Design a protein around this ligand. Structure first.
Ligand SMILES: NC(=O)c1ccc[n+]([C@@H]2O[C@H](COP(=O)([O-])OP(=O)(O)OC[C@H]3O[C@@H](n4cnc5c(N)ncnc54)[C@H](O)[C@@H]3O)[C@@H](O)[C@H]2O)c1
Ligand SMILES: NC(=O)c1ccc[n+]([C@@H]2O[C@H](COP(=O)([O-])OP(=O)(O)OC[C@H]3O[C@@H](n4cnc5c(N)ncnc54)[C@H](O)[C@@H]3O)[C@@H](O)[C@H]2O)c1
Ligand SMILES: Cc1cc2nc3c(=O)[nH]c(=O)nc-3n(C[C@H](O)[C@H](O)[C@H](O)COP(=O)(O)O)c2cc1C
Ligand SMILES: Cc1cc2nc3c(=O)[nH]c(=O)nc-3n(C[C@H](O)[C@H](O)[C@H](O)COP(=O)(O)O)c2cc1C
Lengths: 155, 155
């Protein structure tokens, strides 16, 4: 059934984001296709973190996280494929709340306070309360991920 | 902050699906942009159901649900905009597991057993264990929802 999930999801298009945190001083982040809005009152956003890779642990052990929205495919590939220790060497960034890294190439970002974590199956649902949101750049081309590719929207 | 969430999400592209169930004999479903894969082992998928509209209740009170994947924008609009009592009058469907409606225009669907529900903020995370998946049609144009529109992917 893991294979039927992957086969169906390969053709299910999803927006991508790069979630980051400052994990006891270590700058970390990852490309996710599970980011979404969860609640309006209270204002909550979420993503799913793979427990099998320990992707949950930095967020569980940090008070805040940042959601970076970017149109730079290179950044998504860095934050999916490159070794953790290498990712923040290659990109421009600044620190936000809790020291969480904000990527300079982001056209928007959210700063969130960790609100809850919920283990379900082999992932943890990471839930953040939106503390602030910023729209930096008005002109951008949002990307959607499907079948290992990053597409623009038609028209 | 509910407004910053909406403003950012308006420009965050997301695949859409129509989740259905047979709620004590009542055929119901809704367009969602919160469907995703949650876990591989066990094989779990999820969506977020708005408690403010009672969208959580049918799933909480039914043993199964179906995830319909379709490329028919008309269907997404029916299952977002039209009165509940009208939706299954206008479309071709059959019943699957638990009597859950499978839409004829779906190019793929998942049958799921309700695994857990988790209230977080003003939504409930509805979690289903994948019992079966089906790819009916190999030729289709997946849609992504952004800024109230249903886009095709470029190229
Ligand atoms: N944890 C996640 O939700 C998730 C999502 C996408 C990619 N990834 C990781 O990146 C790798 C490369 O991605 P790809 O697009 O080539 O994947 P793929 O070809 O292995 O799978 C296609 C799709 O299936 C779903 N999926 C795959 N692995 C999953 C997992 N462990 N848990 C929940 N859903 C999963 C994702 O939506 C993915 O894009 C994946 O094999 C996976 O290890 C993880
Ligand atoms: N519950 C949901 O996750 C959700 C998602 C999309 C749309 N909707 C409902 O459909 C209506 C029409 O959609 P639209 O695209 O014109 O919306 P919109 O212009 O009001 O908001 C834009 C986006 O913000 C997010 N959002 C809006 N309402 C939300 C809610 N109650 N909870 C979590 N996230 C929410 C969604 O991703 C939505 O597409 C929305 O106002 C909402 O009531 C609900
Ligand atoms: C487009 C894309 C989407 C991804 N989405 C998620 C996700 O939502 N959750 C997750 O835990 N991992 C996801 N991954 C994998 C993480 O990015 C990856 O495990 C993380 O960067 C840590 O990398 P590492 O284990 O190789 O060091 C995704 C990968 C890609 C290619
Ligand atoms: C594209 C789109 C995405 C939606 N996603 C969700 C969702 O994920 N969860 C939810 O509870 N409602 C979502 N909604 C709203 C439901 O479709 C709607 O509340 C449901 O069909 C019941 O309709 P009603 O309250 O008008 O009767 C979405 C609406 C649209 C337009």
């Amino acid at each position: 059934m893991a294979e039927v999930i992957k086969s169906i999801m390969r053709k299910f298009p999803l927006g991508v984001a790069i979630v980051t945190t400052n994990w006891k001083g270590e700058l970390v982040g990852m490309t996710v296709n599970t980011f979404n809005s969860l609640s309006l009152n209270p204002p909550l956003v979420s993503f799913f973190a793979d427990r099998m890779k320990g992707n949950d642990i930095p967020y569980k052990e940090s008070k805040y996280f940042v959601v970076n929205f970017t149109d730079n495919e290179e950044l998504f590939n860095i934050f999916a494929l490159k070794p953790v220790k290498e990712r923040f060497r290659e990109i421009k960034y600044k620190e936000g709340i809790g020291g969480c890294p904000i990527l300079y190439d982001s056209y928007a970002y959210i700063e969130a306070k960790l609100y809850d974590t919920i283990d379900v199956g082999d992932h943890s649902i990471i839930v953040g309360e939106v503390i602030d949101g910023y729209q930096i750049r008005d002109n951008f081309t949002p990307l959607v991920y499907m079948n290992r590719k990053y597409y623009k929207l038609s028209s």
